[PDB]
Amino acid sequence: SKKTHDMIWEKLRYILQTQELSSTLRESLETLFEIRQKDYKSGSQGLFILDPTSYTVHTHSYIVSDEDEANKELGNFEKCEN
Amino acid sequence: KKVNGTSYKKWSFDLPEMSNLYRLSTPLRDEVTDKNYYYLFDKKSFFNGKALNNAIPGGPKFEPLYPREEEEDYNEFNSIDRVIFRVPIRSEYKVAFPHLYNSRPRSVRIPWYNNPVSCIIQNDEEYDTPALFFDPSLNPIPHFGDFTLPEDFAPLLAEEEELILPNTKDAMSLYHSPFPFNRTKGKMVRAQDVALAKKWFLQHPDEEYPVKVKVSYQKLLKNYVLNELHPTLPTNHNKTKLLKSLKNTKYFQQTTIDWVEAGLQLCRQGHNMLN
Amino acid sequence: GIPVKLLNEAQGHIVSLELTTGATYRGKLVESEDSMNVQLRDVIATEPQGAVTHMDQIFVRGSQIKFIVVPDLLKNAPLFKKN
Amino acid sequence: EHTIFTQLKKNIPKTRYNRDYMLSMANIPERIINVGVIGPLHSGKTSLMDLLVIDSHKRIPDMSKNVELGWKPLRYLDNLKQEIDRGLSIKLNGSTLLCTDLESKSRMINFLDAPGHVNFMDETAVALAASDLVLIVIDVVEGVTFVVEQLIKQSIKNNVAMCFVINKLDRLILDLKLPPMDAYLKLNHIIANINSFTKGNVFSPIDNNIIFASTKLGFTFTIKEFVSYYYAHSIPSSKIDDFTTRLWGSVYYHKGNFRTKPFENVEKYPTFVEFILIPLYKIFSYALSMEKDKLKNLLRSNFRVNLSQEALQYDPQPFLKHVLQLIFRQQTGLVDAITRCYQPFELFDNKTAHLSIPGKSTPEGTLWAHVLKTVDYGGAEWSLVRIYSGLLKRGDTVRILDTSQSESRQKRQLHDEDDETPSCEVEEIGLLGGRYVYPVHEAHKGQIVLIKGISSAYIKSATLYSVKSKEDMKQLKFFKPLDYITEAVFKIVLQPLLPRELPKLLDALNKISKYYPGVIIKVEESGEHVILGNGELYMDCLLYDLRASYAKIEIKISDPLTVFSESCSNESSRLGEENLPGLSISVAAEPMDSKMIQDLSRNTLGKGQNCLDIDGIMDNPRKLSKILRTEYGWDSLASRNVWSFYNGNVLINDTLPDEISPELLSKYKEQIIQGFYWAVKEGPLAEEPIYGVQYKLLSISVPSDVNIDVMKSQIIPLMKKACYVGLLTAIPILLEPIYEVDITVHAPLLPIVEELMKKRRGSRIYKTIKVAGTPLLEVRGQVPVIESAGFETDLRLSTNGLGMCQLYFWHKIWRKVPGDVLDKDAFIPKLKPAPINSLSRDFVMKTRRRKGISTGGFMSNDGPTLEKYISAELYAQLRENGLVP
Amino acid sequence: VSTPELKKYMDKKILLNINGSRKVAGILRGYDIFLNVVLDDAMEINGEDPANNHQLGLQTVIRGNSIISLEALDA
RNA sequence: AAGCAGCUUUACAGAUCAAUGGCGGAGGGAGGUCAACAUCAAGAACUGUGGGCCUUUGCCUAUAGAACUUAUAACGAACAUGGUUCUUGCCUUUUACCAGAACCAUCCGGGUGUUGUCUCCAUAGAAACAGGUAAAGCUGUCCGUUACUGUGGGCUUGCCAUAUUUUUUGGAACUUUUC
Ligand SMILES: Nc1nc2c(ncn2[C@@H]2O[C@H](COP(=O)(O)OP(=O)(O)OP(=O)(O)O)[C@@H](O)[C@H]2O)c(=O)[nH]1
Ligand SMILES: [Mg+2]
Numbered sequence A: 001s002k003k004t005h006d007m008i009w010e011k012l013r014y015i016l017q018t019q020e021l022s023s024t025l026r027e028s029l030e031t032l033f034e035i036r037q038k039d040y041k042s043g044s045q046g047l048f049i050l051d052p053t054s055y056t057v058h059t060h061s062y063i064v065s066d067e068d069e070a071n072k073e074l075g076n077f078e079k080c081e082n
Numbered sequence B: 001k002k003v004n005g006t007s008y009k010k011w012s013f014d015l016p017e018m019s020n021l022y023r024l025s026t027p028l029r030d031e032v033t034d035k036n037y038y039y040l041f042d043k044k045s046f047f048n049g050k051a052l053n054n055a056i057p058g059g060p061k062f063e064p065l066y067p068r069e070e071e072e073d074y075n076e077f078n079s080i081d082r083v084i085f086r087v088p089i090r091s092e093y094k095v096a097f098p099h100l101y102n103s104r105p106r107s108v109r110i111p112w113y114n115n116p117v118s119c120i121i122q123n124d125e126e127y128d129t130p131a132l133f134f135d136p137s138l139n140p141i142p143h144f145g146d147f148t149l150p151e152d153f154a155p156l157l158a159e160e161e162e163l164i165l166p167n168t169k170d171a172m173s174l175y176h177s178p179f180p181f182n183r184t185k186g187k188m189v190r191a192q193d194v195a196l197a198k199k200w201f202l203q204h205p206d207e208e209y210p211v212k213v214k215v216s217y218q219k220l221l222k223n224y225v226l227n228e229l230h231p232t233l234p235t236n237h238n239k240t241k242l243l244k245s246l247k248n249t250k251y252f253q254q255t256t257i258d259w260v261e262a263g264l265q266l267c268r269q270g271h272n273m274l275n
Numbered sequence C: 001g002i003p004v005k006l007l008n009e010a011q012g013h014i015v016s017l018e019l020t021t022g023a024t025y026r027g028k029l030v031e032s033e034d035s036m037n038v039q040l041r042d043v044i045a046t047e048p049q050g051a052v053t054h055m056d057q058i059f060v061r062g063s064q065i066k067f068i069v070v071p072d073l074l075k076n077a078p079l080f081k082k083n
Numbered sequence D: 001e002h003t004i005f006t007q008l009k010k011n012i013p014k015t016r017y018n019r020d021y022m023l024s025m026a027n028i029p030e031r032i033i034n035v036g037v038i039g040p041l042h043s044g045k046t047s048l049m050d051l052l053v054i055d056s057h058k059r060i061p062d063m064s065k066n067v068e069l070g071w072k073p074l075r076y077l078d079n080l081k082q083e084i085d086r087g088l089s090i091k092l093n094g095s096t097l098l099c100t101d102l103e104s105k106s107r108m109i110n111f112l113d114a115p116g117h118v119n120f121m122d123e124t125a126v127a128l129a130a131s132d133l134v135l136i137v138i139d140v141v142e143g144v145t146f147v148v149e150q151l152i153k154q155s156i157k158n159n160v161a162m163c164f165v166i167n168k169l170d171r172l173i174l175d176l177k178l179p180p181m182d183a184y185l186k187l188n189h190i191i192a193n194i195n196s197f198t199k200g201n202v203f204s205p206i207d208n209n210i211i212f213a214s215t216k217l218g219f220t221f222t223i224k225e226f227v228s229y230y231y232a233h234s235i236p237s238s239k240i241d242d243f244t245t246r247l248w249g250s251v252y253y254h255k256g257n258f259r260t261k262p263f264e265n266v267e268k269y270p271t272f273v274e275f276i277l278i279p280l281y282k283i284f285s286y287a288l289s290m291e292k293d294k295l296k297n298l299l300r301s302n303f304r305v306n307l308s309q310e311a312l313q314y315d316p317q318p319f320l321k322h323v324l325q326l327i328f329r330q331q332t333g334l335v336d337a338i339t340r341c342y343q344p345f346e347l348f349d350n351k352t353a354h355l356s357i358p359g360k361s362t363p364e365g366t367l368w369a370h371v372l373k374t375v376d377y378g379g380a381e382w383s384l385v386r387i388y389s390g391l392l393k394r395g396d397t398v399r400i401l402d403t404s405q406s407e408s409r410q411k412r413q414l415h416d417e418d419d420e421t422p423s424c425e426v427e428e429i430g431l432l433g434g435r436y437v438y439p440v441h442e443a444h445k446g447q448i449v450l451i452k453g454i455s456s457a458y459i460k461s462a463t464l465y466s467v468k469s470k471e472d473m474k475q476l477k478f479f480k481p482l483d484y485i486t487e488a489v490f491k492i493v494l495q496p497l498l499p500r501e502l503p504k505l506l507d508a509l510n511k512i513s514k515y516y517p518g519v520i521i522k523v524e525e526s527g528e529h530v531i532l533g534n535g536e537l538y539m540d541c542l543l544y545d546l547r548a549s550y551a552k553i554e555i556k557i558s559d560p561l562t563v564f565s566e567s568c569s570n571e572s573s574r575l576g577e578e579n580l581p582g583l584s585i586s587v588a589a590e591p592m593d594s595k596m597i598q599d600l601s602r603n604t605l606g607k608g609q610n611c612l613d614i615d616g617i618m619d620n621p622r623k624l625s626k627i628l629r630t631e632y633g634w635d636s637l638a639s640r641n642v643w644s645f646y647n648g649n650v651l652i653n654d655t656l657p658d659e660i661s662p663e664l665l666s667k668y669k670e671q672i673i674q675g676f677y678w679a680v681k682e683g684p685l686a687e688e689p690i691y692g693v694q695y696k697l698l699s700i701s702v703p704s705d706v707n708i709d710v711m712k713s714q715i716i717p718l719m720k721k722a723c724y725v726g727l728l729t730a731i732p733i734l735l736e737p738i739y740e741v742d743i744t745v746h747a748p749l750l751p752i753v754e755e756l757m758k759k760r761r762g763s764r765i766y767k768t769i770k771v772a773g774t775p776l777l778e779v780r781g782q783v784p785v786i787e788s789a790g791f792e793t794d795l796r797l798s799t800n801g802l803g804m805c806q807l808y809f810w811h812k813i814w815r816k817v818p819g820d821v822l823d824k825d826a827f828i829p830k831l832k833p834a835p836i837n838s839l840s841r842d843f844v845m846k847t848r849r850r851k852g853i854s855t856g857g858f859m860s861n862d863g864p865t866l867e868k869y870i871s872a873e874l875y876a877q878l879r880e881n882g883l884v885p
Numbered sequence E: 001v002s003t004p005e006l007k008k009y010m011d012k013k014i015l016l017n018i019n020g021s022r023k024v025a026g027i028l029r030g031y032d033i034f035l036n037v038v039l040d041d042a043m044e045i046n047g048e049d050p051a052n053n054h055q056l057g058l059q060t061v062i063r064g065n066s067i068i069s070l071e072a073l074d075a
Numbered sequence F: 001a002a003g004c005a006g007c008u009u010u011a012c013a014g015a016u017c018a019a020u021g022g023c024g025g026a027g028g029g030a031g032g033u034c035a036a037c038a039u040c041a042a043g044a045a046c047u048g049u050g051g052g053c054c055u056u057u058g059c060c061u062a063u064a065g066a067a068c069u070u071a072u073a074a075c076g077a078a079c080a081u082g083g084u085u086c087u088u089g090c091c092u093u094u095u096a097c098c099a100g101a102a103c104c105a106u107c108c109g110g111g112u113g114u115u116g117u118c119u120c121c122a123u124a125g126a127a128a129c130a131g132g133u134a135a136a137g138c139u140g141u142c143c144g145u146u147a148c149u150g151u152g153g154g155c156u157u158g159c160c161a162u163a164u165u166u167u168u169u170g171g172a173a174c175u176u177u178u179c
């Protein structure tokens, strides 16, 4: 989703350059700009065990503005007549 | 508007047509924009590789310019108990600073000291990226009723609102393009005077290429240096051309026919001339 | 205007200024202003009645001056050309 | 073969002004000002002088059609066949132009274009000494790199006003393609960077200190110039100076009112962006892309600029350069910034007090001038001189004194006669004009002219005076030897190939030592000539002028070598003796303090707005004992008995006959110091200079008779012998110089550089600066000079042209060579680099054989040993204790 | 618009002639854009130097319109 | 950048409708795989004109114009061949050759400037007259609007503040001697 992700970068770049920031936070934010030119090669290591067709693609398209039912209740004990 | 006339000299184009010829020519384009890529590969360094009897590793190999190098002059000067060895003097050192590194430099032409370190940013992934854009890999810039003018005072160009025109992304790409793309005006050259494959052997080949081509890149450079080294200038008093003096004669007449007809006529004429 | 610009050209040049009071101050020009008030160095002063003295430094208000004499060479100064 | 120069008087290009009015402006010292353009490498300096010249001359014969269009820069001032081929300024060159500012007051200005390359930092020292103010031209992409940091610190030191040109603004948009708000931030980041280094004065575009320029496109402006052209009509005349104050500096404009905080409901940029950068980028955008007719309407409507019918049929880069030269006129705002920055009352007294001794102003009867350098200007040999007092005509006769004499001759002139100075005749005076000399009958006070007929009298600098009365000779001030910023360290030892061609070489070596000021040429006892230079490119410039220009013979040339220095790391019956026992000296040696050595390298002794220069460091012995006791914590006795500071070294009298008879010592003191100078110049290890050793005169014997003839001539070689005994006993070491490195590489190519620093021996990267707004970053590090042979091109071949380094010797960093110098068992492999523990033995043993001090068949090691100086019976006593190997 | 440049003179004893006949010499403290000049320890010079001279006041200000010329007696 | 005024024009109504003055006009415009003739590598370099010195040349000084080509140097962003000489290679003789050098040429091309020709398209003449060159209104005579207004366009313009100390909204007025 490069197009909106450029727009996330552009507003995030506007933070350092035109606005004052606390010091300890500031060197971590420009470190992200340093990893950007190193092309994210230190955030791309994980356990890709599943093939892209072995993982059945259930890309759950939920948003964080939905009330998400908070199903705590099935972790309790109940009584199967089933 | 584009050509001067049917004599077909002096073409003149516009921006849209020029970027269109640019995008078609991608296969045969030079595709290098900084001159610093040609650091030890320019022809001044080829002349010094010839004159000093050195071999640039991609460069061509030439006979010794001074074959009588065999003599050694006995002296205390260059002896091993004199010399301090820290860095081995590579041949690239001898070509880059030719009057420093090697004694007896003669018929040696000065090379050109580096052009400024070229950072030119091209955008190729998305046409919807604008002309002016803070590209990746660019370091960020971390930093930081009294008076009244008449209203409707404005900047100079403020009546025009768009900074980026639809042709600016093309025009800046034409601005850095190597000749002749940047020109958008020029004269006609002959069909054999355009050297399409010239830029290929004027660049470094590859690592992946086999040793069969890598010689063929060297042999074409060796031809290229010898043409540049010995220029044969034309004389100005050559006013009698062959076709023009034959045209003045009553025994030669002029017409227009097809090329393949003119080829078959020449094969029949040439067969009769020998027979 | 050009006439004042010319006065800047005079600067550092021995110039003669006649006051509307009648005096004459001839000497070097230290400074000038758009107002036209001129201050001189090593001026030889001529009173209106002719008595001549010598003053180390001087400043004269612009309004007072009747005319200024500037170096003849200035005439071909670059600014003057119409086109 | 040597220069492209116009030799005919008739072919000298005419100016737009008459040029006679310019010569009459030379009568006025206040009218003429001398600006020297200095900067980093390839920053557009010579191209900046291209703009001044072609706007001053009506038609140049040298200017071609690719030059008239935007295709190739016309490098007028580069001038030399050597410089055309490198594409690099090698020599100082200049022009003298009449220039008009915004207020249209014409004033004559002498320009000097200093070379940007860091090996030619000696040439810019000539430019700093010549110039009233310096115009420091900055690449906007590189920003403030470290070589900019030195130039801004030097011009503060030389009491020279500064004016800054940010150059190559096209690269900000045509190369880097920054959005306009980002480019403001780039410009704001640079101006913040220069303001941190000028501690005295803020530099800001409102202040008229800072000039924006894009030289290849050939336009320059200040914000004051740009308002007066195009915004002066629209606003009332009282408002204009207040308006341009609001222009830069984060205050915003919309519908007639200014406010510091951002405008609500409005997408807004700062005022400098809205009024300057946004129209400038629309000029770049529309000259490249807009239809020519619709562009032609905007230029009449907004800039009142008519495009020609011929100018419509241009290529895009010539059309862009043409429009910007129509919008931005001749360089008035640059000239205006030069005028407003220079204050002669503030600095001209301090500058002459810096180049000479501080004193009262010499009278106007004295002719008094400073001869900067000898110039190999086209077809002849000219002296570059600047006149500080009096009037000079052709055919005059002038006392011309070399500045190496001026230490004694000034110190003599205090005097609590005749034949003082050689007299040469002023043969011919000319104004430099780049590619030509305009001959002139007389040369007034304040202007820089070229004089033929004075170069035979001096080497590397001179003072030039014609005095009227003998009493006025008491007042006159001599010029100090010129401070070239880089010390010459790189060694080349050259022998002519044909021995019969030797005196022709000696002519050229005397000839080069005039033209190249930074070069130290010496002759050794072996007949081999040693040349000291700044770097690789400096030597390659040196040897081409040697082989091709000056001496047509061929020469044998050694490898790259470096000057070493000799020191000690510990303090050390310590005594010395001669053949005839009438004299006995004892000398101790000690390492000097690291802060003490570092400040003496800075040519002044002190700390915290209190410092004493080395020239008058003897003249305040009470104040000197205050500084040594307070700042460095020495003893009170050691503070009072210091005799002399020779370069990086010190002598202290610590003896009991000084408590007995110091007046007997005082009549012999001046030649102990003369013998001390005779010992530091050639040390005991390898005939190399001594650096950073605290000498203590432990004792001195006076024989039972006084002969002023014999005792004087005998103690001078024996004190030099006695200093060796102190140093060799005191655990001697060998020092090597350290280049500091300034690498500019793209950000992905940084691990290539880090591996490239590991292949060298004593290299370390100390600081890595993200150059903002650019994909490249600055790397600051160090390298030994003996390791920096071909360091410059190894970097580039590995980075494929995206890397560049500047090697320089600003800070005089001398570092201990990692071996032990007295190792009889050090393994020196032939034809390979010796390992790290064998280095101090190797560098001395080879140096002793270049000099001829140690003579072996192939490799015989008689090390620098404490037995040829001390008696051999005492040397066997030293072996049994384990003190001496 | 532009301030007159008296800057070097200030703190120096100065003689200046005002309007028709009068000459006044005093230390000069302040100047403005109209040239109005205020100087302290003012004295009105006349033919007889010690005699007809009379001091004016501790502080005196002068309209710039009546100034004909200013000469500083001093460095 | 609007408006007003000034300037320039303009479709003009004009003053004159004379002598005038300005700008234009006194034998086209675009072309051609058309031609001829000049010219195209040198103190970083050219030519015309005026003045002075020596006695034409040459120098010095003043002035006017410089097309094309050239600086990481060359008409050509391209790139062959031959000759002589020297030094190699191949190794039965020669020719053809190997691949450096030095000096010369040939060949395929190119720019520019004049003049002529050819093709296509043209029509207001006042394009009327008289002189002459290697060239032309080259010159004289001349004709178109017209030199002084008002409307309508453009700006080489006003500095947009027009009375309150440095300029243009008054420190002015009056009387006296000498000659
Ligand atoms: N893009 C760009 N390049 C420029 C500009 N000015 C100069 N250059 C180029 O930068 C290089 C160096 O320019 P120079 O004129 O040699 O500058 P310099 O500072 O005199 O250089 P040195 O001789 O090294 O001292 C050349 O290739 C120029 O064409 C500019 O404004 N923009
Ligand atoms: Mg330069």
Ligand SMILES: [Mg+2]
Residues within 6 Å of the ligand: none
């Ligand atoms: Mg036979």
